[PDB]
């Protein structure tokens, strides 16, 4: 009479990028959902309590490099 | 770990509820909260 003990699992949290690079977004729009500092915040970009990247100014997104092995997302007011 | 209700002296309403350890701090907790009606940081006391 063989038994089991590995049929438990949690729900999946839709993580990853929510906005593409070069797309127009409005202030308050989420840009990234992660568990830690996978992507640092750039210009006009704040960090939430759950390490969520959001925009504060309406403009276009821009994913660039910060340092040598760290990425960062910023937003520019220029339409 | 039990519930704690910070009572007021002028307000008379329990709009501030927190938690604490009876085994750790068995004495009454006394902090300075803010009662909107009085609109002044008053000294609240646990019942």
């Amino acid at each position: 009479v063989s038994s089991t003990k590995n049929g438990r699992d949690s729900e999946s949290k839709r993580l990853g990028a929510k906005r593409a690079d070069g797309q127009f977004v409005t202030g308050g729009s989420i840009l990234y959902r992660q568990r830690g500092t996978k992507i640092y915040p750039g210009e006009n970009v704040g960090r939430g309590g759950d390490d969520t990247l959001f925009a504060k100014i309406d403009g276009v997104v821009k994913f660039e490099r910060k340092g040598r092995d760290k990425k960062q997302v910023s937003v520019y007011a220029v339409a | 770990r039990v519930n704690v209700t910070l009572a007021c002296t002028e307000c008379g309403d329990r709009n501030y509820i927190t938690t604490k350890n009876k085994r750790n701090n068995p004495e009454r907790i006394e902090m300075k909260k803010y009662c909107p009606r009085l609109n002044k940081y008053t000294l609240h006391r646990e019942t």
Binding site: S2, S3, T4, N6 | -
Partner: protein
């Protein structure tokens, strides 16, 4: 009788058998060795069975090298019960070998003596082999 002292997981996923050998396609210890030409799973029982048949005819007159070690253990359900009840217990340890991989390596013996000793150990292996010598060109 070759098996790891301890492993993190006792249940693997069965190593894939495709492509060519990743590395170890040249003899670097002995002068002659057995090179595989087909892909199959080599168990520890067969590995020790071929080694005992090689030393028996060599009469302790040379050095033997094994370039393969069972790293993946496989399970097996006994007494053929109904399917769907979880994984079974470990049965033994195997090792995937792809074409171009050297199996054994002999040294300090006659060239014709190593050609006969390797032929006796090739009859206890389930893969087509080929006698090769140290290349240098």
């Amino acid at each position: 009788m070759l098996l790891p002292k301890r492993v993190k997981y006792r249940r693997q996923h069965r190593p894939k058998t495709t492509g060519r050998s990743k590395g170890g396609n040249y003899v670097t210890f002995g002068e002659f060795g057995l090179q595989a030409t087909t892909t199959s799973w080599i168990t520890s029982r067969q590995i020790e069975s071929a080694r005992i048949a090689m030393t028996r005819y060599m009469k302790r007159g040379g050095k033997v090298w094994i370039k393969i070690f069972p790293h993946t253990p496989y399970t097996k359900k006994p007494l053929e019960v109904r399917m769907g009840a979880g994984k079974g217990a470990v049965e033994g340890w195997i090792a995937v070998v792809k074409p171009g991989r050297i199996l054994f390596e002999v040294a300090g013996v006659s060239e014709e003596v190593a050609r006969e000793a390797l032929r006796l150990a090739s009859h206890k292996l389930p893969v087509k082999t080929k006698f090769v010598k140290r290349e240098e060109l």
